[PDB]
């Protein structure tokens, strides 16, 4: 139930028709990584966490940036023991179109 970490590459401010990576990782061995967007059209994307050396990460790929993919992005993680129970939400990351 420990909050994971969320980052945006190359950054949170994106240009139109450009792809970004929203990396979600934590030292806890999270098996499922869920990214939730809050905005004009809320959505919840799923990605299986890949447990590399030390951390389990997930590279969320937000495609060609439209005004619909902009909003507040928070990240969650869960264990297959109960995919129902998510963890604490990560710190919110605001993605805005340039």
């Amino acid at each position, epitope marked *: 139930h420990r909050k994971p970490s969320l980052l945006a590459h190359p950054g949170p401010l994106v240009k139109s028709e450009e792809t970004v990576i929203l990396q979600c990782w934590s030292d806890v061995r999270f098996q499922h990584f869920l990214l939730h967007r809050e905005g004009k059209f*809320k*959505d*919840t*994307l799923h*990605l299986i966490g890949e447990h590399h050396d030390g951390v389990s990460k997930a590279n969320f790929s937000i495609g060609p940036m439209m005004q619909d993919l902009a909003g507040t992005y928070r990240c969650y993680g869960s264990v297959t023991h109960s995919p*129902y129970q998510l963890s604490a939400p990560s710190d919110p990351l605001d993605i805005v179109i340039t």
Partner: antibody, heavy 125, light 108 residues
Framework: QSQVQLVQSGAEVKKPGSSVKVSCKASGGTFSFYAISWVRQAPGQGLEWMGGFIPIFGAANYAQKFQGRVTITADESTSTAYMELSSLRSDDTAVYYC????????????????WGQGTTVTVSS | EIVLTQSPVTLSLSPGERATLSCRASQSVSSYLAWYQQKPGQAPRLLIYDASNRATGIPARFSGSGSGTDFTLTISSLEPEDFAVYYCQQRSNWMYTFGQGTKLEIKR
């Protein structure tokens, strides 16, 4: 194409003004981070959405026409889903369906939709 | 609340012809649009998800298109098994409202 399969409760006959609770048991998986959507089709009519439940967010979204008489829930195991309809009217005589669909997008690892066999509920005096 | 309206009501086409179905939304759902097919006597089957992506196992003759308020389901080379009822359903903002539907019948 998903390994998950859904089985619903048997048919029911209720009187006008009573309540009915239909169950949706999942096999080969759990509702997990997906959403539970219930739909109804009356004889000759089309598909009518009743509402949905996303267990991970503890969120229940319902349709205005059923808001107030409908309740969608699930077991802590997230293996059995339930929809209870109160103030039953004859217009509620239809076949009710339960579906395991994604909360929104089917982005990346999301299995295709899985429906149940359906449940015929007849409300008549 | 967003109301999905489908056109036409009944489509009378012949085997081998190209079919076009339209789903119009009162407010934008932005590719959160699903297409279902109900053959009489059976439950609905998912055909197109996310407005344009074809479901697993669906023949390539079915195609999805549209974003926002207008959506189109194209079935080229209508195979006799395709004549049924087709519904569109929104999947935006946790609301899964259905369309009225469209009957695809055989024009003889």
């Amino acid at each position: 194409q998903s390994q998950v399969q859904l089985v619903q409760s048997g048919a029911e006959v209720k009187k006008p003004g009573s309540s009915v609770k239909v169950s949706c048991k999942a096999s080969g998986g759990t509702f997990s981070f997906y959403a539970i959507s219930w739909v109804r089709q009356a004889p000759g009519q089309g598909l009518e959405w009743m509402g949905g439940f996303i267990p991970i967010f503890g969120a229940a979204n319902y349709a205005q026409k059923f808001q107030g008489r409908v309740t969608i829930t699930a077991d802590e195991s997230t293996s059995t889903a339930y929809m209870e309809l109160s103030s039953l009217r004859s217009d509620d005589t239809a076949v009710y369906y339960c579906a395991r669909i994604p909360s929104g997008s089917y982005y990346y690892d999301y299995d295709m939709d899985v429906w149940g066999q359906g449940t015929t509920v007849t409300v008549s005096s | 609340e967003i109301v999905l309206t489908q056109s036409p009501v009944t489509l009378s086409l012949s085997p081998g012809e190209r079919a076009t179905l339209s789903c119009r939304a009162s407010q934008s759902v932005s590719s959160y649009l699903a297409w279902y097919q109900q053959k009489p006597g059976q439950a609905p089957r998912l055909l197109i998800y996310d407005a344009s992506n074809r479901a697993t196992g669906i023949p390539a003759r079915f195609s999805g298109s549209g974003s926002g308020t207008d959506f189109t389901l194209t079935i080229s080379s209508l195979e006799p098994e395709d004549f049924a009822v087709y519904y569109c359903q929104q999947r935006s903002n946790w609301m899964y409202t259905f369309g009225q539907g469209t009957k695809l019948e055989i024009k003889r």
